[PDB]
Design a protein around this ligand. Structure first.
Ligand SMILES: Nc1ccn([C@H]2C[C@H](O)[C@@H](COP(=O)(O)OP(=O)(O)OP(=O)(O)O)O2)c(=O)n1
Ligand SMILES: Nc1ccn([C@H]2C[C@H](O)[C@@H](COP(=O)(O)OP(=O)(O)OP(=O)(O)O)O2)c(=O)n1
Ligand SMILES: [Mn+2]
Length: 557
DNA sequence: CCTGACTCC
DNA sequence: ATAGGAGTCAGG
């Protein structure tokens, strides 16, 4: 039904200057993962190649690394990184079907070729899950079955390129793919493969001291409670707090009494056990996640951790970070912040450099809402609890939420919101207009033409409709800020390279960039990094970047 | 596997 | 009813 050559050796007709290429890595975490199969589709035909054969072939390897030999792929970053671990360089990726699908509509959650193919009623390819199976049942099938699947995926990519590119052009999103997301993919691949070095000696010492403190807090809690119980079970905790100790029930969820941090905080005037419990649950998360969980994913020989930045997941155009997540390392409490002392440069006499956008989404909003008062404050170039309120309000917090938030009266909360929109009447207008626009069009868009569809926005159900309306208010701002830092990464890399600096990116944290570099390059970076980030886009307001460097991530403040 | 914790932006 | 976007963990 689909002819292909199950090849024993690489031939010339496989090395054309345009091809759909499949380099199959079946493990979800592709760092140092096996490549199980290769497929090439071009004008000359369809081929399957065994990886041990192809990857040890000097012409095939040469062809992968040749930028002028153009490849169309699905999830090229997965392939590029897996190939780096195999010591092979991949260049010339001209079309990425995953990223194409993602821009057309991030809600499809497209995560295999079959799911992208569905968008264009192309069905001559199976889903990966159907071929490999699930969980403990997962496995690479017999070679002829595997070969047909990889070929069918290459065929699908080969025939789907033009239809996807055609639709992107119609949406005015083709430049967003080719000039932004695709180049970013290569940059992210570099960061992931580079990894971040960890001071395991220090992290393990922190872990030993944390275990002692946990024990102390745990016993204190039992004493206060008059009983032992599992503090980490909201159910058992609920019984202690609301049945044994008879504290007021302020909130319930579908499964029982709430013990959220917000609720516990409000119960502080009733019993001191709630403050101990909050402390215990912080310490316990530090241990389970940022000591134990982090140590489990350190590569022992190099002491490096290699995250995967998911570039086609969030509904707003942000990245996410997994296994481990390096975008949520503690910072707000000194006790947790000390985890950052364990993230260190990968070479001696190198340093960590961290730069952060000031008030990014408020500046973006000022530009898009063209609010004179707000654009004014930033032209005059004018706290953690305040920041949360600022963003709360512009993004549609209610009087109830703000009151519960600042533990103030609802009346007072409602007044505050009213005066906030008086200080910034353009913002208010922008938010009423953007909702009406979303209702009329069925989607909202960002500065660089990223899109999010909101089919729920005219629901008759109040809850459903309201959530969609708040997405209409937030997505263009959060998403526009995502566009800006992404452009900034691309320009920064180019500027680092031409100036032949050794500095390279390690992490992006939504509106921060983290690099490491030889100590000699700090003065140069102090100028180069903020300049490029600030000049990424030009808005009606200024972009402002704060920066710091130090011996460890902790000290880069 | 889901829920409800803690963590970040 | 009750700002938005994320991931990992232990418990059940
Ligand atoms: N074919 C296109 C055209 C534009 N864009 C994206 C990337 C551009 O940086 C952004 C802005 O496009 P232009 O500045 O070229 O056009 P406008 O100035 O008119 O912007 P807009 O159409 O949003 O008003 O939109 C795109 O992805 N593909
Ligand atoms: N509670 C929060 C925190 C952050 N963000 C979003 C908006 C922020 O602008 C962006 C970046 O987070 P920051 O903490 O860096 O916020 P700022 O850039 O506004 O402040 P700063 O000047 O301190 O960097 O993420 C948000 O929506 N809600
Ligand atoms: Mn910032």
């Amino acid at each position: 039904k689909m002819a292909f050559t199950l090849a024993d050796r690489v031939t010339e007709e496989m090395l054309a200057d345009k091809a759909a290429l499949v380099v199959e890595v079946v493990e979800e975490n592709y760092h140092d993962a096996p490549i199980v199969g290769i497929a090439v589709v071009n004008e000359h035909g369809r081929f399957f190649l065994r990886p041990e054969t192809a990857l040890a072939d000097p012409q095939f390897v040469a062809w992968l690394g040749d930028e002028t030999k153009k490849k169309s792929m699905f999830d090229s970053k997965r392939a590029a990184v897996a190939l780096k671990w195999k010591g092979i360089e991949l260049c010339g990726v001209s079309f990425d079907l995953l990223l194409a699908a993602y821009l057309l509509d991030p809600a499809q959650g497209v995560d295999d070729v079959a799911a992208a193919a569905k968008m264009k009623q192309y069905e001559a390819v199976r889903p990966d899950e159907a071929v490999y199976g699930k969980g403990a049942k997962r496995a690479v099938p017999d070679e002829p079955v595997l070969a047909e699947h990889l070929v069918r995926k290459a065929a699908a990519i080969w025939e789907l390129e033009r239809p996807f590119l055609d639709e992107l052009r119609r949406n005015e999103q083709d430049r967003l793919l080719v000039e932004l997301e695709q180049p970013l993919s290569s940059i992210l691949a570099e960061m992931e493969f580079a990894g971040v070095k960890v001071d395991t000696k220090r992290l393990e010492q922190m872990g030993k001291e944390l275990a002692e403190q946990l024990g102390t807090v745990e016993q204190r809690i039992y004493e206060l409670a008059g009983q032992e119980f599992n503090i980490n079970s909201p159910k058992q905790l609920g019984v202690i707090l609301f049945e044994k100790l008879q504290l007021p029930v302020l909130k319930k969820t579908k499964t029982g009494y709430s013990t959220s941090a917000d609720v516990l905080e409000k119960l502080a005037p009733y019993h001191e056990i709630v403050e101990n419990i909050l402390h215990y649950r912080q310490l316990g998360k530090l241990q389970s996640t940022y000591i134990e969980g982090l140590l489990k994913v350190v590569r022992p020989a190099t002491k490096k951790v290699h995250t995967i930045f998911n570039q086609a997941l969030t509904q707003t155009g942000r990245l996410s970070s997994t296994e481990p997540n390096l975008q949520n390392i503690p910072i707000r409490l000194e006790e947790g912040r000390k985890i950052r002392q364990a993230f260190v440069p990968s070479e001696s006499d190198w340093l960590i450099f961290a730069a952060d956008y000031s008030q990014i989404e408020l500046r973006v909003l000022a530009h898009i809402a063209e609010d004179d008062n707000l654009m004014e404050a930033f032209r005059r170039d004018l706290r953690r609890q305040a920041k949360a309120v600022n963003y709360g309000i512009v993004y549609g917090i209610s009087d109830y939420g703000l009151a519960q938030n600042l533990n103030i009266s609802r009346k007072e909360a409602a007044e505050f919101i009213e005066r906030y929109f008086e200080s910034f009447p353009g913002v208010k207008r922008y938010m009423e207009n953007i909702v009406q626009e979303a209702k009329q069009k069925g989607y909202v868009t960002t500065l660089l033409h990223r899109r999010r569809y909101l089919p729920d926005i005219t629901s008759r159900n109040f809850n459903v409709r309201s959530f969609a309306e708040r997405m209409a208010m937030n997505t263009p701002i959060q998403g526009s800020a995502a566009d800006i830092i992404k452009k900034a990464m691309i320009d920064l890399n180019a500027r680092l390279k031409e100036e032949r600096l050794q500095a390279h990116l390690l992490l992006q944290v939504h509106d921060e960039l983290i690099l490491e570099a030889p100590k000699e390059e700090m003065e140069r970076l102090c100028r180069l990094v903020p300049e490029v980030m600030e000049q990424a886009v030009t808005l009606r307001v200024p972009l402002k970047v704060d920066y710091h460097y130090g011996s460890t991530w902790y000290d880069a403040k």
